[PDB]
């Protein structure tokens, strides 16, 4: 029973990003990870494989396995007729052994010779193209409607696709309802993370997927007039009237303040939800939050070790003939400045297997897929000084242990045969890396830090000093934009934006020390035509060219190039979205980020750009124009520095 | 559907200059790169290979794999019969995996012995000839017809051939239309770059490719009829009446000034073009530019680092058993006066993998296949100070770092052969290395057109060509406008900024006593031909030229008035075709060069266009005067010498 959704997971979107996988004699294991939502069951799962073997393989003494969680579903041999030709084969997968997180590992065995075959040879191989994929049909089930499994029915940690969570309001939400929805969206985005977050908004329209309903006891939305009035803000999870297989989270409250309290409780106090109709009464804070204090970001007050950067169990160790590279991800804030220019120093405590004779087997430490240093294996506390040349908002530190075993091969008349021995490597969760020798001072008119990390607004993980303006009685598009940008800012960090301030009139902006986030439109007191570009009046627009556009500028920007040259104004008939970052006239340190659009199609394109991440990482400079043909960015305007010294 | 053109590109051009690629045990990977126009789909994708293996290779244990985008299309095994004979093969490439940029990779696996094969040996080799290219067809689809993708429908950065963008007019263009077309051509050439730009000129006729038509609400091309009269410079993107596959960019307007406004907007305000029928209303500048400031030339205000000389992301890093040569192309202006031979001092900071033992592994620096210096890889990195003598720096040179590794892999004893896999070594240069050019001055002799053929110095001293005046004849024909557009686009492509503030005049009355360079496209005015610095004059079947009294194939860096003295002015007449490129001093300012591009017959104009279009011919241009005939370009340095610049 319930709707059935056919799913085809191509080999490109689930395998590592070389596209295809090659199974040699030293690396014959090819892994593919997928997951189950924990509320659906997989039925009629089949694995297609379009692979090419090597022509030097033996027909019967060389086959390939298909292991599903250490369970052999079937073995495929290579016939003499299909030794070098393209081979297509479909294998039925038993859905009984499927679990929440499954790993299909293909093991390849090959024997090009029979009396003197040598491993690590490039004559035997079997490569699977990226045209294959898994074909499986998920079948939804009926959950127990228990709030203890929260946010299980709305967000599962075993999923890989974007988390689309529509939020149905009651129509024209006021500032309080907007703030509550923003807090909930920030929490959901922080829980999701890299999976992607999308928050559609509808008015008096029940969606197909699981959604969250917001009520006020006065402006009751549709299909809730029959529900009786409440005395306190309650959180209830009821079924959808049409189809019970989708669940709706109804939030009630006497007024907007009770709704905000309920949202705050859902954000923080969600570890003790019990049964159904949870009543939240008292949620108060004890102490404020320190700046630059985000879970995902690295701690700068003390030296950080590798134990707090694992997010895994066996990440700092490997095995096998060719020990895979050990990757550790460092999430640093985009506000880092070093005048000493000596570079960050780390104490590596790597250990390895002592080879028989020194054969120049090495280990390479690389950063951002760029070689950094090498160390010969001939168990240490090496001090490595990383030159700060690509340390942005996110990077990857990769230790690759390159080995070559000087194994003998006998004489011309007597060749010896054996099996190659494996070697293990491990770094150890005790290697520290210093990050307190850096300062927080950067020239910040650009949008790269905002698109990648949300710096001007995510200085405090809770967004305490953040004022977001919104037009009077917003429509669905502006609310969707606000929810999406807030969820993105929350996902870049690890804490929900709970203390954000949503306003509607510009009077509150006057005389207030906090960053500004324009969504609907720039107010009258702003857009003084100074240090502001891309004013779009829904009819025409003008853009300034900064006298030069050179890719890959220097680390420290120059002011002779970043200067307005010509102001080109023009009227059009299409749709565009403008992301503009500039300085606030009230405070020098604070900034103003404006995401505006000219037409409903422009708002849709802006929401799509903010939702995804492929088109967001390619945004930099102080101005970004998103048109029907993609996003183009440029760096124009004055330069103002945020930070002390 | 649509027309399907068949092109068979060979490995002679899409491969390194040597053409043939030999796959050995050190670099068994051969690369062949080609782009996709993003507007036409591939439908045939057939590859032809002509390869010769080595006789020592084993038949079955050796083979040749062919990846398209890291996906194995097909594998060709060696056969005992074709062990040492030339082998021809055909491969059907799957067009369902083509992308904007495809890199076909040929990998060679070698096995000549079973017990012990010496890695990186010389007996293992499989060569491929330079007549083994691909055969593929392109089927053009229907474009969405929107300006948001502009200038993709009219110029794609993925192609490699010259973008022939024919510009259409209505006959007898005026000065405003001339300068507007020049601005558009300059912007298109700047966007194209080294791809080469050709701008054919059509009058009142319709092309068969992507073109740009101009209109002023008056004197229209006669095929824009029934179109409403516009009140502003609207820019629409309409289809061709004959076949809707090719698109035509129509630039309407009210007068000749509106066309100039539209051209300026297209050149500078092309970032917010959306939908179709984009109408500009105001495009004004905020501040002027500075001399010797081009988006493509290096900046002399301060020492520039290697981070601005990349044009890529992984250019300064290479991997493999033998890392490839790291090439960085820096284009400096030819005005640098370094006759003192002080040398450019650069602080290079290179990182590499330390070998197990000092084994003469070293890096070599080269400047145009030269040898600047060598640094051993056993010095136990660092800010190495390298002094490059300026006695060879031109205007489009490059710098090549070659890391030669003497990888000492063991081989075992006399009785035991130790076989293994050779570990690779990486290498990176880094973006922290710097090279200074601010401590130099601008002062050079300019009775020379080499700096004009390369980097277009005289006119491109300023990026926007502010003080640049181009004279034109009365009612220019197709050839004159074509050569004007071609030279303007070439100047714009050599630089990075479009020529916007240049002046185009139909008479020599404005150049009298005006501080600006002079570019003669047609004939020399009667007032300027009285000068004595006219080395070569091309009249109606009457040409004369002087002789420098000597000519060395490799002249010194310092000019000598004695070696280039004028002697034996010889005149003659004929009935052939010949174009002339002359450069002399202006008699109005004493520090501004006048360059003229003369031609007499239409064949001469076509020859001049073909010469100034491609860089292969322009590279041969040097000296003070150049003659272009059916046999090519021959240049000589005659006349007096005048030193332009300061100090």
What string of DSSP letters covers B193-216? Answer: -TT-EE--EEES---SS-EEEE--
CA–CA distance, A468 with A460 (Å, rounded to integer): 15
CA distance A373 to chain B (A): 7
Q: Does the beta carbon of A548 lie under 8 angstroms from any beta carbon of chain B?
A: yes
From chain A, the residues in CB contact with B62 under 8 A are 123
Q: Determine the 3-state secondary structure of B607 from DSSP.
A: helix
- Of A56, A570, A574, Cβ closest to residue B280: A570
Both tokens assigned to A131? 């045209």
Query: Are A235 and A266 a contacting pair, CB within 8 Å?
Result: yes
Cβ contacts of residue B530 below 8 Å, gap of 6+?
Answer: none
Residue B366, number of CB atoms within 10 A of its CB: 17
Helix axes A476-492, A175-192, angle to 10 degrees: 40
Q: How far is CA B240 from CA A343, A530, B37, B209, in A?
A: 60, 44, 20, 9
Cβ contacts of residue B243 below 8 Å, gap of 6+?
Answer: none
Breaks (C-N over 2.5 A) in chain A follow: 378
Q: Does the beta carbon of B278 lie under 8 angstroms from any beta carbon of chain A?
A: yes
A467-477 b/e (C-beta count within 10 Å ≥ 16 → b): bbbbeeebebb
CA–CA distance, A504 with A483 (Å, rounded to integer): 16
Phi, psi of B605 (to 5 degrees): -65, -40
Phi, psi of B177 (to 5 degrees): -60, -40
CA–CA distance, A309 with A320 (Å, rounded to integer): 24
Identify the closest residue of chain A to B299 by CA–CA distance. A561
The answer to whether the CB atoms of A543 and B269 lie below 8 A apart is yes
Q: Does the beta carbon of A476 lie under 8 angstroms from any beta carbon of chain B?
A: no
CA–CA distance, B343 with A130 (Å, rounded to integer): 53
DSSP string, B169-184: E-SS--HHHHHHHHHH
Both tokens assigned to B599? 């031609």
A interface test, pick of B234, B270, B274 with most A CB neighbours within 10 Å: B274
CA–CA distance, B220 with B169 (Å, rounded to integer): 8
From chain B, the residues in CB contact with A358 under 8 A are 356
Cβ contacts of residue A272 below 8 Å, gap of 6+?
Answer: none
Query: Within B402-533, where are the H helices?
Result: 450-453, 478-494
**Placement of tokens 């599962």 in the chain:** A156
Breaks (C-N over 2.5 A) in chain B follow: 380
Phi, psi of A307 (to 5 degrees): -70, -30
Fill in the DSSP letter of residue A411: B
The answer to whether the CB atoms of A572 and B308 lie below 8 A apart is no
Bridge-based pairing of strands B625-629 and B579-585 is: antiparallel
CA–CA distance, B577 with A366 (Å, rounded to integer): 62
Bridge-based pairing of strands A234-239 and A247-251 is: antiparallel
Q: Does the beta carbon of B247 lie under 8 angstroms from any beta carbon of chain A?
A: no
How would you class B281 by CB atoms within 10 Å of its CB: exposed for 0-12, middle for 13-18, buried for 19 or more?
A: middle
Q: Determine the 3-state secondary structure of B444 from DSSP.
A: strand
CA–CA distance, B159 with B40 (Å, rounded to integer): 11
CA–CA distance, A109 with A27 (Å, rounded to integer): 10
The answer to whether the CB atoms of A371 and B295 lie below 8 A apart is no
Per residue, the 3-state secondary structure of B110-140, as one string, reads: CCCCCCCCCCCCCCCEEEECCCCCEEEEEEE
Cα four-point dihedral sign B273, B279, B283, B289 = positive
- Of A19, A540, A568, Cβ closest to residue B69: A19
The answer to whether the CB atoms of A371 and B355 lie below 8 A apart is no
Phi, psi of A480 (to 5 degrees): -60, -40
CA–CA distance, B92 with A86 (Å, rounded to integer): 13
Q: Using CA atoms in the order B180, B186, B188, B190, what is the torsion angle rounded to 10 degrees?
A: -150
Q: Does the beta carbon of A574 lie under 8 angstroms from any beta carbon of chain B?
A: yes
Query: Are B586 and B449 a contacting pair, CB within 8 Å?
Result: no
Residue A322, CB-side half-sphere exposure with 13 Å CA sphere: 14
Q: Does the beta carbon of B109 lie under 8 angstroms from any beta carbon of chain A?
A: yes
CA–CA distance, B113 with B419 (Å, rounded to integer): 12
Would you give the distance in Å from CA A54 to the centre of its chain? 38
Q: Which residues 120-179 of A have a C-beta within 8 angstroms of B?
A: 120-123, 127, 129-130
- Of A26, A573, A632, Cβ closest to residue B277: A573
Would you give the distance in Å from CA A237 to the centre of its chain? 28
**Placement of tokens 């929440």 in the chain:** A100
Both tokens assigned to A60? 């019967």
CA–CA distance, B190 with A172 (Å, rounded to integer): 50
Phi, psi of B266 (to 5 degrees): -65, -35
Query: Are A613 and A453 a contacting pair, CB within 8 Å?
Result: no
From chain B, the residues in CB contact with A621 under 8 A are none
Query: Are B217 and B253 a contacting pair, CB within 8 Å?
Result: yes
Bridge-based pairing of strands B46-52 and B87-92 is: antiparallel
Residue A241, CB-side half-sphere exposure with 13 Å CA sphere: 7
CA distance B591 to chain A (A): 28
Question: In the structure, how many helices (H) and strands (E) does chain B have?
Answer: 6, 44
Q: Does the beta carbon of B255 lie under 8 angstroms from any beta carbon of chain A?
A: no
The answer to whether the CB atoms of B424 and A404 lie below 8 A apart is no
Fill in the DSSP letter of residue B417: B
Q: Does the beta carbon of A217 lie under 8 angstroms from any beta carbon of chain B?
A: no
CA–CA distance, B39 with B390 (Å, rounded to integer): 45
**Placement of tokens 């100074």 in the chain:** A530
From chain B, the residues in CB contact with A570 under 8 A are 265, 269, 272-273, 278-281, 283
Q: Does the beta carbon of A371 lie under 8 angstroms from any beta carbon of chain B?
A: yes
List residues bridging with A249 in a β-sheet. A212, A237
The answer to whether the CB atoms of A370 and B317 lie below 8 A apart is yes
Altogether, the residues listed in chain B come to a count of 647
- Between chain A and chain B, how many beta carbons pairs sit less than 8 Å apart? 225
Q: Determine the 3-state secondary structure of A256 from DSSP.
A: helix
Q: Does the beta carbon of A564 lie under 8 angstroms from any beta carbon of chain B?
A: yes
CA distance A266 to chain B (A): 43
CA–CA distance, B425 with B355 (Å, rounded to integer): 9
A interface test, pick of B73, B420, B433 with most A CB neighbours within 10 Å: B420
Cα four-point dihedral sign A313, A315, A317, A322 = positive
Both tokens assigned to B40? 């036409």
Both tokens assigned to B431? 């973006």
B interface test, pick of A364, A629, A631, A637 with most B CB neighbours within 10 Å: A629
- Of A52, A54, A552, Cβ closest to residue B310: A552
Q: Which residues 381-400 of A have a C-beta within 8 angstroms of B?
A: 387, 389
Q: How far is CA A286 from CA A186, A283, A493, B193, in A?
A: 21, 10, 22, 63
The answer to whether the CB atoms of B114 and A112 lie below 8 A apart is no
Q: Does the beta carbon of A539 lie under 8 angstroms from any beta carbon of chain B?
A: no
End-to-end distance of chain A based on CA atoms, in angstroms? 65
Range list of β-strands (E), B286-421: 304-305, 317-318, 326-329, 336-337, 344-348, 351-352, 362-366, 373-376, 384-388, 398-404, 418-419
Range list of β-strands (E), A201-274: 201-203, 211-214, 234-239, 247-251
Query: Are B639 and B447 a contacting pair, CB within 8 Å?
Result: yes
Q: Does the beta carbon of B268 lie under 8 angstroms from any beta carbon of chain A?
A: yes
The answer to whether the CB atoms of B427 and A371 lie below 8 A apart is yes
CA–CA distance, A21 with A30 (Å, rounded to integer): 7
Bridge-based pairing of strands A566-571 and A540-545 is: antiparallel
Q: Does the beta carbon of A325 lie under 8 angstroms from any beta carbon of chain B?
A: no
User: Quick one: which of A507, A502, A497 has its CA closest to A457?
Assistant: A497
CA–CA distance, A289 with A295 (Å, rounded to integer): 12
CA–CA distance, A282 with A262 (Å, rounded to integer): 9
B interface test, pick of A378, A574, A623 with most B CB neighbours within 10 Å: A574
In angstroms, what is the resolution? 3.4
Is the bond into B560 cis (omega within 30 degrees of 0)? no
Q: Return the biggest CA–CA distance within chain B.
A: 93
The answer to whether the CB atoms of B423 and A407 lie below 8 A apart is no
Fill in the DSSP letter of residue A82: T
Identify the closest residue of chain A to B285 by CA–CA distance. A566
DSSP string, A576-613: EEEEEEEE-SS-SS-EEEEEEESSHHHHHHHHHHHH-S
DSSP string, B251-289: E--SSHHHHHHHHHHHHH--SS--SSSEEEEEEEESS--
Identify the closest residue of chain A to B107 by CA–CA distance. A122
Residue A285, CB-side half-sphere exposure with 13 Å CA sphere: 11
CA–CA distance, B212 with B220 (Å, rounded to integer): 13
From chain A, the residues in CB contact with B432 under 8 A are 387, 389
Both tokens assigned to B503? 């002046």
CA–CA distance, A98 with A102 (Å, rounded to integer): 6
The answer to whether the CB atoms of A572 and B275 lie below 8 A apart is yes
């Amino acid at each position: 029973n319930g709707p059935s959704r056919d799913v085809k997971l191509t080999f490109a979107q689930i395998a590592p990003p070389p596209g295809s996988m090659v199974l040699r004699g030293i690396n014959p294991n090819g892994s593919i990870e997928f997951g189950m939502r924990s509320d659906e069951v997989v039925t009629k799962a089949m694995l297609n494989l379009e692979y090419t073997p090597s022509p030097s393989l033996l027909p019967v003494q060389s086959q390939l396995k298909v292991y599903l969680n250490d369970e052999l579903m079937g073995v495929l041999p290579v016939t003499k007729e299909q030794l070098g030709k393209k081979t297509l084969a479909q294998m039925p997968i038993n859905p009984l052994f499927i679990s929440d997180f499954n790993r299909v590992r293909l093991e390849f065995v090959g024997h090009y010779q029979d009396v003197c075959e040598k491993p690590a040879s490039t004559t035997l191989w079997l490569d699977v193209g990226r045209s294959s994929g898994l074909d499986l049909t998920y079948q939804t089930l009926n959950v127990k409607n228990d709030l203890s499994h929260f946010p299980v029915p709305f967000f599962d940690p075993s999923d890989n696709r974007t988390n689309t969570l529509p939020m149905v309001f009651a129509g024209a939400p006021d500032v309080g309802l907007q703030q509550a929805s923003a807090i909930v969206a920030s929490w959901f985005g922080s829980r999701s993370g890299w999976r992607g977050q999308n928050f559609p908004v509808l008015y008096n329209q029940l969606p197909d997927r699981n959604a969250i309903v917001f009520a006020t006891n006065d402006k009751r939305p549709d299909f809730l007039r029959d529900h009786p009035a409440v005395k306190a803000p309650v959180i209830e999870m009821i079924n959808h009237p049409q189809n019970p297989y989708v669940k709706l989270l109804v939030v009630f409250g006497r007024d907007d303040k009770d709704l905000l309290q309920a949202a705050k409780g859902i954000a923080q106090g969600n570890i003790l939800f019990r049964g159904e109709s949870v009543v939240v009464n008292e949620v108060k804070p004890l102490l404020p939050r320190k700046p630059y204090d985000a879970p995902n970001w690295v701690r700068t007050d003390r030296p950080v070790t590798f134990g707090e950067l694992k997010t895994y169990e066996e990440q700092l160790q490997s095995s096998g003939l060719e020990p895979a590279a050990i990757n550790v991800s460092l999430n640093l804030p985009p506000d880092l400045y070093l005048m000493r220019s000596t570079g960050i120093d780390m104490d590596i405590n790597y250990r390895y297997t002592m080879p028989p004779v020194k054969d120049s087997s090495r280990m390479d430490i690389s950063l951002n897929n760029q070689f950094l240093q090498s160390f010969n294996l001939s168990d240490g506390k090496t001090d490595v000084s990383i030159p700060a040349l690509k340390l942005g908002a996110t990077n990857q530190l990769r230790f690759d242990f390159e080995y070559m075993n000087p194994m003998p091969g006998g004489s011309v008349d007597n060749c010896i045969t054996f099996q190659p021995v494996q070697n293990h490597v491990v770094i150890g969760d005790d290697s520290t890396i210093d990050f307190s020798k850096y300062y927080h001072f950067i020239p910040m008119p650009d949008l790269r830090a905002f698109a990648n990390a949300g710096f001007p607004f995510s200085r405090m993980a809770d967004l305490s000093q953040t004022i977001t303006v919104m037009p009077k009685a917003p429509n669905e598009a502006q609310m969707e934009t606000l929810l999406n940008t807030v969820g993105f800012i929350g996902a870049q960090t690890g804490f929900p934006a709970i203390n954000l301030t949503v306003t509607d009139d510009g009077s509150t902006i006057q005389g207030k020390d906090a960053d500004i986030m324009i969504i609907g439109g720039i107010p009258d007191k702003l857009k003084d035509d100074k240090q502001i570009d891309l004013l779009v009046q829904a009819t025409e627009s003008w853009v300034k060219t900064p006298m030069r556009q050179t890719p890959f500028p220097g680390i420290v920007p120059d002011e002779s190039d970043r200067a307005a040259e010509t102001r080109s104004t023009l009227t059009s008939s299409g749709a565009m979205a403008a992301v503009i970052g500039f300085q606030s006239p009230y405070n020098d340190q604070r900034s103003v980020i404006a995401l505006l659009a000219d037409s409903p199609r422009g708002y849709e394109m802006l929401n799509d750009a903010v939702n995804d991440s492929g088109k967001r990482a390619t945004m930099f400079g102080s101005v970004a124009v998103i048109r029907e043909s993609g996003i183009n960015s440029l760096r124009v305007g004055d330069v103002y520095y945020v930070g002390h010294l």
